[PDB]
Amino acid sequence: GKLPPGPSPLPVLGNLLQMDRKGLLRSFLRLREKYGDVFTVYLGSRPVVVLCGTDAIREALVDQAEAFSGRGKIAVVDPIFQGYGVIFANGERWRALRRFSLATMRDFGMGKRSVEERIQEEARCLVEELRKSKGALLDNTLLFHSITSNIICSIVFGKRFDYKDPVFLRLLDLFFQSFSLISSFSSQVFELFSGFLKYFPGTHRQIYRNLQEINTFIGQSVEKHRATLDPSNPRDFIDVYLLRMEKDKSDPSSEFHHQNLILTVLSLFFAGTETTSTTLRYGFLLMLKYPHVTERVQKEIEQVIGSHRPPALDDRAKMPYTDAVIHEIQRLGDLIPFGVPHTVTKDTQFRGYVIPKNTEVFPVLSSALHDPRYFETPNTFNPGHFLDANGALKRNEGFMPFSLGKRICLGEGIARTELFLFFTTILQNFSIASPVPPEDIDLTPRESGVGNVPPSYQIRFLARH
Ligand code: HEM
Ligand SMILES: COC(=O)[C@H](c1ccccc1Cl)N1CCc2sccc2C1
């Protein structure tokens, strides 16, 4: 059988000359033009099948679910994970860690409170914090990280850190600093000639160093956990894992050991922080470009929720407008423009092609979220893409900002609760304003890579009465 169509590789250099100085995403989309929806390109000596549009991705990730369930690797961070922890595990280790990982976020945690209740509490702390700024213009970057972290922290490390605590301000810097270097221009060069480049200095050193410094903190918290553990009454994620360590003393094939634990907390502690939060950032940037929409969300909050009780997650179903606005921030925000890389698990017959076992597959989620076949005028913000005549919420197949399939975002339910409660709680209590007029807000990312990062912007949060 055949590999999909695509340009001709100079070996060692692969397809360097058919790429584009813009980035990995521009490059793939510029080839989509020539070779179709499924196609093959050469990053270094490595072949990758590339998937485009709703229909291609869905065929692969959902119709050949298991076939496409394997994970690839981000060269810039594989020094750190090396096939360990939940994001980057594969086969049995992955199955095991995902399974445990779903179960554990749903139930055991700080104050034995529900994830909702916890996100509620964080939101309550964001409000009090924001009030303190008295409407002065800030940059919302830092607070937006603080609040997403503290959720993940409260789950994994069983506690939340105070916004000014310098132990914690330093984890946030590392995390933000890395996630931006991760998706800088250099780290994409690196995605191509990792083999050659991993010798000379560069941006991957910095990322490695930064990540190792988080592992240190993760490490020294596992230890406190283990010391002061209690079998009767597991505090949180780490505590539960340790008890599963004990349950598994006599299983030689148990995957619950110190590497996976450390690197699972790193994955969670990463994703938990750096996406749910840049989404919020982008979301508020859009609200500054579209005060009309913000007034409608704010009226909808006034009707369904009112101005005294805090927002609750069951309100979402009663608030389709807001729910559309959030959908539409995820779609246009589009913070993972070409998925996290997959690999096929067996030899696979795809659109009458053979994709050999272990060949890397890039589901380009951004070309689904901007897919003209499913969204009109797909580069413009419109909450209407998710509403019908009657103002009811309206599902759309092109909408997969969390990927699809067997590898679908595990955090999805937390992400969605954080989005809904954080935007409705801020918007219930504050009115927003920037110096920049709506007509000159630019939505062009400060970095477009393996993830998208919105530009910095000023914003002010005015207490409503
Ligand atoms: C709105 C914010 C988020 C977005 C847009 C998002 C999106 C994604 C995407 C696109 C993937 C790749 C799925 C794939 O290619 O198979 C993924 C994987 C993953 N995400 Fe999320 N995510 C978000 C929030 C979170 C949160 C809050 C957590 C923390 C619990 C999280 C944890 C994970 C994990 C553990 C994986 C790996 C799943 C696996 O490999 O089995 N994500 N996410
Ligand atoms: C690839 O761009 C990201 O936004 C990711 C991401 C977010 C959510 C789910 C999975 C992923 Cl990989 N992060 C956050 C977690 C980690 S671990 C090493 C690097 C990154 C960058």
Swiss-Prot record:
Residues the record lists as Phosphoserine modifications: S101
Catalytic activity: an organic molecule + reduced [NADPH--hemoprotein reductase] + O2 = an alcohol + oxidized [NADPH--hemoprotein reductase] + H2O + H(+)
Native species: Oryctolagus cuniculus (Rabbit)
Cofactor(s) needed by this chain: heme
Similarity section: Belongs to the cytochrome P450 family.
Localization (cell): Endoplasmic reticulum membrane; Microsome membrane
Name of the molecule in the record: Cytochrome P450 2B4
Cell membrane as UniProt keyword: no
Keywords, ordered alphabetically: Endoplasmic reticulum, Heme, Iron, Membrane, Metal-binding, Microsome, Monooxygenase, Oxidoreductase, Phosphoprotein
InterPro entries, A to Z: Cyt_P450, Cyt_P450_CS, Cyt_P450_E_grp-I, Cyt_P450_E_grp-I_CYP2B-like, Cyt_P450_sf, Cytochrome_P450_fam2
GO MF term set: arachidonate epoxygenase activity; heme binding; iron ion binding; oxidoreductase activity, acting on paired donors, with incorporation or reduction of molecular oxygen, reduced flavin or flavoprotein as one donor, and incorporation of one atom of oxygen
Bilayer disposition of the protein: Peripheral membrane protein
A Pfam family annotated for this UniProt entry: p450
Function comment: Cytochromes P450 are a group of heme-thiolate monooxygenases. In liver microsomes, this enzyme is involved in an NADPH-dependent electron transport pathway. It oxidizes a variety of structurally unrelated compounds, including steroids, fatty acids, and xenobiotics. In the epoxidation of arachidonic acid it has a unique preference for the 5,6-olefin.
Lineage: Eukaryota, Metazoa, Chordata, Craniata, Vertebrata
